[PDB]
Each structure stands twice: as structure tokens, then as C-alpha cells.
Design a protein around this ligand. Sequence first.
Ligand SMILES: Nc1ncnc2c1ncn2[C@@H]1O[C@H](COP(=O)(O)OP(=O)(O)OP(=O)(O)O)[C@@H](O)[C@H]1O
Ligand SMILES: Nc1ncnc2c1ncn2[C@@H]1O[C@H](COP(=O)(O)OP(=O)(O)OP(=O)(O)O)[C@@H](O)[C@H]1O
Ligand SMILES: [Mg+2]
Ligand SMILES: [Mg+2]
Lengths: 214, 465, 109, 71
Amino acid sequence: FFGETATGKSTTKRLLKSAIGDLFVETGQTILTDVLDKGPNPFIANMHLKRSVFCSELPDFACSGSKKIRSDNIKKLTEPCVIGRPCFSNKINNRNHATIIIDTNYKPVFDRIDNALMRRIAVVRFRTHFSQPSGREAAENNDAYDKVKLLDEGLDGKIQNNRYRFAFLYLLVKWYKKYHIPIMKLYPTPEEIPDFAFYLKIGTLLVSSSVKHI
Amino acid sequence: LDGNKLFNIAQRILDTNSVLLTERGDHIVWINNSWKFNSEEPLITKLILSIRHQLPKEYSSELLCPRKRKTVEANIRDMLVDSVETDTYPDKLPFKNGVLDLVDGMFYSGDDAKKYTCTVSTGFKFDDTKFVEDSPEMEELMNIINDIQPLTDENKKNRELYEKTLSSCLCGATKGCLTFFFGETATGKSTTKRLLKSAIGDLFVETGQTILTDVLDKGPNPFIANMHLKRSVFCSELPDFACSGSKKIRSDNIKKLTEPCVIGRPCFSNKINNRNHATIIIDTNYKPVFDRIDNALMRRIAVVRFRTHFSQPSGREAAENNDAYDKVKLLDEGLDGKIQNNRYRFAFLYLLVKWYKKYHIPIMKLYPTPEEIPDFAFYLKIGTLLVSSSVKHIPLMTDLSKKGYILYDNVVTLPLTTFQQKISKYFNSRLFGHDIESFINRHKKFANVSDEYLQYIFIEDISSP
Amino acid sequence: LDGNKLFNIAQRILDTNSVLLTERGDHIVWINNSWKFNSEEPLITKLILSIRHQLPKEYSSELLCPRKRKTVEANIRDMLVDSVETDTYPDKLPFKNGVLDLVDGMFYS
Amino acid sequence: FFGETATGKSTTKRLLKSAIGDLFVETGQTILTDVLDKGPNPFIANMHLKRSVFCSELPDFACSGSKKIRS
DNA sequence: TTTTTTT
Ligand SMILES: Nc1ncnc2c1ncn2[C@@H]1O[C@H](COP(=O)(O)OP(=O)(O)OP(=O)(O)O)[C@@H](O)[C@H]1O
Ligand SMILES: Nc1ncnc2c1ncn2[C@@H]1O[C@H](COP(=O)(O)OP(=O)(O)OP(=O)(O)O)[C@@H](O)[C@H]1O
Ligand SMILES: [Mg+2]
Ligand SMILES: [Mg+2]
């Protein structure tokens, strides 16, 4: 979930949480930046049999000393069984049923880039701003916003009371019927992240040597 | 003469040989035509309740009360004072309701399967109806296998090695080397892994990479503990070592994994010894590297190459240009669903049985292939081409001085200038200059202030001119 | 010649397929149209107390005392020897009091 | 035991192991260069009441960076 | 370059 400040990603997360109850779970950034199988890792353990996992507030990697995202973690986070150990336990097999969503303000940075990682990334953008009456004019001069609206202060509390729970559940069911009825599958979108585009364009400009060129 | 009734009941239970004590201190029971052991479950009480029927009619009423069952369990645990050995037959396959003999193909059940003390099982019942050679599912499986590994004159050796490695997982002996599944994206390694897991049931296991990077004797380690008495161990997604921060695979762990017994302890249990009966498969798209190189290390490494790409219809043209692929086919989007529902379990079992009956019946052994690792290639090239000196070179001493090997201090002394000129004209400098410098600085010696030497005579110089 | 009353009660409880054993080693019970499991709570005793009503009236009085419930739980634990697999349907949404079928939208309780 | 390869060292080791049964034990060269007071050391408990401790396949001291076997 | 975890 990539976008600027005050674009509604958090509201979407809260709506989904209120809709799907405790099947939703939020987990820190350790799972993307360290070894999962060393020592007790309750963050991995709590991911067992969950249906949606959220990781939020990705730091900017331009800052010095900030560790980058590891490719092996992403590869390990897509197979049906993820190896992890709870505290005071020895079971090391967890069933992976969860859709993993990350809320970030900056583009991700990976240490190593290859096709295998390239086929496991999708990005959706938010380009609307919910501002205050005072800051209405300032937002008009930003290219990161395609629309500007007025903030609603009392909306958040209404979400806390589960006012839009069953309506959102019905909408989700309708969307699931619309899309995933034949078969469920997710399609990568590598043409968004910049370095991926560099890899694509460098790949398409060369052809491997063969006997036909002799 | 009629003493304690519970003692007599326990004696009768012990007389049928259904409870046994292992060497390391485990109790194994015989329930539902299978040997089971579980330290967190009251298996002895379950066995007592189950075999209550076989006892005379005057004992079931006593056995119905749980306290009497506890007393009988205590008596039984007290009587037995001897250990036994288990899993002494490497050519048997244990199932949930019997044991299959891989030699004759006959399937045993009941007491016949009891004589072989197999403490692990595939976890599912063996069905003879589906264990047939002619079936549409078998044809589909054969087509898929041919698609993944085409049978050609170029791929015949690779396919033979692949078949041997896959069939090795059935036997319960100790394997001398592990196998690397190397390939590109969407090549079929995961499909093979899932098919093997579905075929062999509970005998399959997957663990983390910590076994190849960290020590094993420090503290409890359930990852090693779960490996005990397993038939196949799988690990995946080895990180690229080109980037900084990657940790090399320690050869000490590789040496320790090739031993019949392995150290490691679970939580809240003082069980430190485990039997190594498993074939280790590491699948990755990056060739591994190691800190140290020696003959004993590359004598236990094998590599299998996957070179068939299953791509999207839109990506067929792009994949065709890439040289890493030899065949580009379509992308079946329903294969994973069928595999997960065990649509090819018994067909794969039959195919593996045939492969075992074609390769491993005379003798089980695995042969390493150290000619594919880039790190081992340079060291092997030294070993084949560059040889050291010995006392047998005394008759050649005159020619040795002619080329430069002076017998200072009763040892050959070839100047490093001549030696580096030789290696530069033979060993290409640009490819492995750093490795050549490491060779020079490793076994460096000086005869005197201006006679720096290495006691290695290149093979055209060992030949008498 | 009927034997232990508690054993008969435990057999009757087991015959309803309300408690099952999972391959991970935890027992799952069926209370209030839901499957529950917890490694730190005695769910078996809760099941025994809750489903006491449907049993014949000569057994509820026995089921009142906690010691009898503990003995019945011991019998039930002794009788369970098999394992089953859970969560094999990827298109059902489970709630606190039923399961919703995503294919049709029908709700089963 | 210093000598050429395939000179019978492995044969003698196997003969000694078969002669003394479980009294034989094999340990790596790490303890020869590592600190024995740090961390758990089940190896130190291993050669207790033993009769033969074998350290074989020693690293090449010629290799740069190899840890010297502390006296 | 150990601490917590584990008994
Ligand atoms: N449709 C809407 N109309 C009015 N106000 C809205 C609307 N959607 C969201 N808001 C409000 O606008 C504010 C900004 O939303 P929010 O904080 O979720 O944005 P964000 O970009 O996800 O933020 P961050 O990434 O910093 O968490 C919130 O107070 C939210 O309640
Ligand atoms: N014979 C076949 N025909 C068509 N599709 C196939 C065939 N065999 C396998 N596939 C499909 O190929 C897809 C990719 O295979 P798989 O995931 O095993 O590749 P991989 O190279 O091991 O992947 P990665 O290394 O990225 O994990 C699977 O979804 C599977 O359905
Ligand atoms: Mg927000
Ligand atoms: Mg794969």
C-alpha cells in the first residue's frame, strides 16, 4: 500500500479488521529483516492459520544504517509452510493461509534483485488527500495528490463502533464472487518499482548468443 | 498362589511383547498394527484399554477403572529392565496398516509386520487397488515428469542421477552425501518437492537453514530433534552469497550431517542422540560457497540441474531468448490443486518403487559430482594438473636444477618467479588471480633470501626430459 | 452385566463425535456451534458439563461432581487413539455461531 | 600421527576403535583453538571416563588466517 | 560483539 500522508490506508486497514474480526493480525518488521528460524519467534508463531497479516510504517532506506529488505525472507514467506518456533514450544511448522499487506510511505529497497523475487511483488497506489481547511491551498501544489477533499473528524469513532462491519462484509463477499469464483490467483506488477523496470529494459534489449548469428 | 491381581494382569500384558524399551529410554507400544512412541501421551494406558479384550473375562472390569490402569502401568514400567534395537531393516517401508517389502513387493500386516520394529510410518493406509501400473493418473504423472526432465542424449545422465536421488529416499540406511537442486525460476523444483512429500507422507520433513550456518551443540535445538529417524529432509531458499552480509556454509556442519548419529536435544527432554536415516535436499537458484575447501568436503557434494521453463503465454517470447532455459512450455494453473488433494500419491509411489527396483537392489551408494561447483573447480584443476614433490624425484634432480628446483636443505626449491610464470602460462590469471595469490601465500616458503620456493612440480616437469 | 457407570457415560460422550484429536497434539471440542481449542484450559470438562442435558437423567447427577468429570475426561483421553486433519475447505467463512458458504451465500448452523 | 596419505592411518584408527569398543571417541580441532570456559561444552563431558580421544583431519597451518593451536 | 529462553 503505497501513498502519501492522509490518503486512507489506515482507514482501509481498520475497515478490514472490523469486517473480518480476529482473523486479521498485525506483525512488526522483524519478519522482513532478520532470520526467522533462530530462537523463539512469537511474531512468526502468531501468523499460524491467519487469513490476513499487516505490516505497517516501513522506514526510509535512504538513511544510513537502515537495513534493507532481504530476498530470502520474501521467498520464504510464499510457500505453504513457514518455519518458526513459538516460545516454550518445539513445533516448527505453521500453515500459511494469510494475505500479507505492507503499508509504506517510500518505495521498498531490496539487497538482491532477480526474476524469482520479481514475480512475487504487487503494488497499489493511493492518490487522494484528506486535508484540513487551512491546508487546502498547499495540497493543490503537490503532484502526489490527484484530488483533495475535506477531513471528517467523527468518521474514525464510527469505525471503532463497527458501524460499517456487515456492509463491508457484504461488499467483500460480492467482490469475491466477482473475481475468485473460477480460481483464485494473484498477478505480479513489476512494471512499477523502478529498478525492476531497469531489469526489464536491460533484458529486452539483448538476445543470447546462438549459432543463428554465425 | 493367587497374589496381586493387578500384578498378574501386568505380567500377562508383558508376556505378549507389546511394550518395548528403546536404547535411549523410550517406550514403544503396538497399537492398530503399528509401533508408536510419544513422550507427551499416555500410550501405555491406551494399550491396556485396547487389549483389555484379549484378557480373560475376570479382568476387564478391573481394567475399566483408570486408577487400576495407572497401577498396572506402574507395574509394567517397573518390570522391564532391558533395551532393544529398532529399525534394523533398511529395505522395508512402514505404512499405517502394514509394512511393504521392497524386495519382493509383498505387503505384510498384523503379526507379520510386527517382527520388523519400525517406529515411524508414512501416516496413511496402503491401498492395493490404486497401487497399479496402468492408470490415467499414472500417464499424466509420466507426462509431467517427462516435461520437467526430458529424456534426451544430453539429459540422460542428469535424468538418471535425478531418478537415483529421488528413489534413495525410500531406504532407511544412512546416506553419504546430500543433493543440491539448482535451477532458475518456474523450473519445477517446488512441484517435485510437493510430489515427493505427498508420496512419502510423514517420512518427509523440512527444516530451516540454521543447520548449515550455526553450531548444533549449543542449547536445545528442536530443528535437529525433528530430523531424527526421518527419511527425507528438505531445505529451501538459500540467500545469494555475492552480496555482503551473507554467511557461508560451514564444512564442519556438512561433515557432522554425514554421520550415522547426530547430536541435538529437544525442549524438556534429555534425548541427545538421533539416528540419521535421511537424504538431504537443498533447493536454491544460487550455487553455494564454503569457507574451506578440501577433498573430504567435495567427496560428498552432488548437484542436479533443472532446465525447463513453464511460462505465461505472454512471456513465451521473452523466455525463449534467455539461454538459461532449454524448453519453454505452457503454465498449468490447476496442477497445484490436484497435487494438494493427493491425485498422484500411489502413482508416484509405484514409479519410485520401480526406480528402486532398477537401481538400488544390488548396493546402496551415492557418488558425488564435484565438477559443477565453481569454487571446487579451481582446486580440482590444481589437484589434477599441479602435483607436489616427493623423495622419488631424486633421479630427476639434475633436470629439476635445470628448470630451477634446487635441492636446498634436501628439498626441491623452485623460485616463485619461475613458478608464477608457469602458472600464468597455464592457469589463466584473469579468471582466478585472487585464488592464485591465495595459493602462493598459503604454502609459501623461502629457501634463502632470494630462493623463495614451493615444493610443487608441474606435471610436464615431473616427466623426465 | 454393565460395568462402570462413568465408563458408559464416557462412551456415550465419545459416540457423538464432539471431541477430536489433531495431528499437532491438541484436542478440539464442539461447544456452541464452534470448534474450540486451548492448551491452557480444560475444554473437555466444559464439554462434559455443557452436554450433560441430552444424556439420560441418571447421569446428570453424576456429572455434577467435578471429580466424576475428571475421571470421565481421563477415560475419554484414554479412548482417543486416532488423528484427523482440520481446515481443508478454503471457501468457508467460520463465525462464532455457524459457517458461511462463499459459493452460494447460504449460512449453516 | 604425521605421514603420507593412505599409509594405514585410517586402518589403524579403525583397528583401535574395534579393539576398545565405546572407549574410543572422535572430536574436532575447534577445542584446540577455542575458549573452553565460554558457553556449554558437552564435548568436555564426552571424553570423561574415556580411553582414546582422536583429533583427525587437522587444518592446514599453511593456510592464511588459520587459528594456531594454542599451547 | 550476551543477553532471554529454559529447567
Ligand atoms: N472519505 C473520507 N472522507 C473524509 N475523511 C476521510 C475519508 N477517508 C478518510 N478520512 C479521514 O482522513 C484522515 C486521513 O486518513 P488516514 O490517517 O487513514 O490516512 P493515511 O494516508 O492512511 O495515513 P498514515 O499512512 O499516516 O497512517 C483520517 O482522519 C480519516 O478518518
Ligand atoms: N508439466 C507441467 N506443465 C505445466 N505446468 C507445470 C508443469 N510442471 C509444473 N508446472 C507448473 O509450474 C509452476 C511453477 O513451478 P515451481 O513453482 O515448482 O517452480 P520453481 O522453479 O521450483 O520455482 P521457484 O524456484 O521460484 O520457487 C507451478 O505452479 C506448476 O503448476
Ligand atoms: Mg492513515
Ligand atoms: Mg519453485
